[PDB]
Amino acid sequence: PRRTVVLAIDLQAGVTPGCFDEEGVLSRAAALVERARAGGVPVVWVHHDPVGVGTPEWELAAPLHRAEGEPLVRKNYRDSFADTTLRETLDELGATHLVITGAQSDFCVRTTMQRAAAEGYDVTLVSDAHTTVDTEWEGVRISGEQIVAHTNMYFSGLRYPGQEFVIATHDHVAL
Amino acid sequence: PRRTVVLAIDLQAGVTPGCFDEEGVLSRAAALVERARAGGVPVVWVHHDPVGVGTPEWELAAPLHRAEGEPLVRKNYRDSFADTTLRETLDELGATHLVITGAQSDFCVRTTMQRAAAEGYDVTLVSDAHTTVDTEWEGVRISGEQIVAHTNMYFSGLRYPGQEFVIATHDHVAL
Numbered sequence: 001p002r003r004t005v006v007l008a009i010d011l012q013a014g015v016t017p018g019c020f021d022e023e024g025v026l027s028r029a030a031a032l033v034e035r036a037r038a039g040g041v042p043v044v045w046v047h048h049d050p051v052g053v054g055t056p057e058w059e060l061a062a063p064l065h066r067a068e069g070e071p072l073v074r075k076n077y078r079d080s081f082a083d084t085t086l087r088e089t090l091d092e093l094g095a096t097h098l099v100i101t102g103a104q105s106d107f108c109v110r111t112t113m114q115r116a117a118a119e120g121y122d123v124t125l126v127s128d129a130h131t132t133v134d135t136e137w138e139g140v141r142i143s144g145e146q147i148v149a150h151t152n153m154y155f156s157g158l159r160y161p162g163q164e165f166v167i168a169t170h171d172h173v174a175l
Numbered sequence: 176p177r178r179t180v181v182l183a184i185d186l187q188a189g190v191t192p193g194c195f196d197e198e199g200v201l202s203r204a205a206a207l208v209e210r211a212r213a214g215g216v217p218v219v220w221v222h223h224d225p226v227g228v229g230t231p232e233w234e235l236a237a238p239l240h241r242a243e244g245e246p247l248v249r250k251n252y253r254d255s256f257a258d259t260t261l262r263e264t265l266d267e268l269g270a271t272h273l274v275i276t277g278a279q280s281d282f283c284v285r286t287t288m289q290r291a292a293a294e295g296y297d298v299t300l301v302s303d304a305h306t307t308v309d310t311e312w313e314g315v316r317i318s319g320e321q322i323v324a325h326t327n328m329y330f331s332g333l334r335y336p337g338q339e340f341v342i343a344t345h346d347h348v349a350l
Binding site: 076077078079081083106107110112114117118133134136137138139140141142143145146147148149150152153154157158159161162163 | 281
């Protein structure tokens with residue numbers, strides 16, 4: 001009995017500004033959430049507390065809005081499962097398949113999606129609904145765009161025995 | 176009681192050719208293994224079976240050589256823990272801290288190191304002893320060098336409660 005849950009990670013007002021293709025990614029994430037709601041697919045929100053609990057930056061980035069009945073999980077680390085109620089929430093929902101949108105691609109999204117894979121979930125990464133910022137290290141620059149693309153590349157070939165991983169766009173992912 | 180184990184991933188003759196800074200990475204990995212041996216730190220080798228079991232490509236890349244008493248774990252997926260004897264081997268050794276060198280940075284190394292973190296290990300990524308190849312996706316190119324650098328950047332900020340993660344060079348990592 002596959003039960004799909006949309007997992008929306010840290011799409012917060014203090015996180016998304018400056019990210020590659022920010023407005024478009026937010027628009028597509030919003031569309032995904034609407035399609036999920038229309039299809040009766042549960043939506044679980046994840047918020048990063050170190051953004052600043054109680055401040056506007058911690059709240060969802062426009063134009064995203066949480067609906068009644070949609071759980072919100074608060075976390076302090078990149079892995080959304082680490083010291084959180086996420087697993088308990090998903091189990092309560094009976095989730096077997098996670099459809100992931102969020103930010104940032106190379107930190108909370110990367111760490112959470114790979115943790116989900118490790119835990120045994122089927123996972124679908126929404127290729128056009130995650131983003132991050134330009135960065136540099138060891139004397140070389142790597143753009144947010146490059147990180148997003150490389151992340152999608154990585155996920156397209158991710159394999160675990162008995163599990164299914166899909167890279168899909170926000171308007172084509174099965175809900 | 177911290178017990179450190181060096182985990183050397185897929186440094187195989189069919190894997191490393193074409194990788195960024197290949198000769199240097201192999202040289203430094205070899206030096207790391209020698210220092211580990213001199214310090215009585217166990218070394219565990221991981222080999223990727225889909226490279227071609229029984230073929231020369233599956234064997235360690237020169238100039239690496241396995242010593243007596245050093246376990247070798249064989250795997251079929253990016254996650255070295257998935258359907259393998261790795262956990263059993265590490266537990267037998269009583270490992271609490273994994274020092275990771277290997278290839279490729281963005282596939283088996285990425286997936287295994289993050290799995291190790293998830294499992295509760297302390298993990299040290301050896302910044303100058305992992306590598307991968309140039310690639311491209313979604314119309315943008317991202318070099319092996321860029322991937323290595325970004326990987327080190329990522330690992331430098333990885334955090335889990337009660338766990339320690341270190342980014343360190345092959346000649347400075349504590350053994």
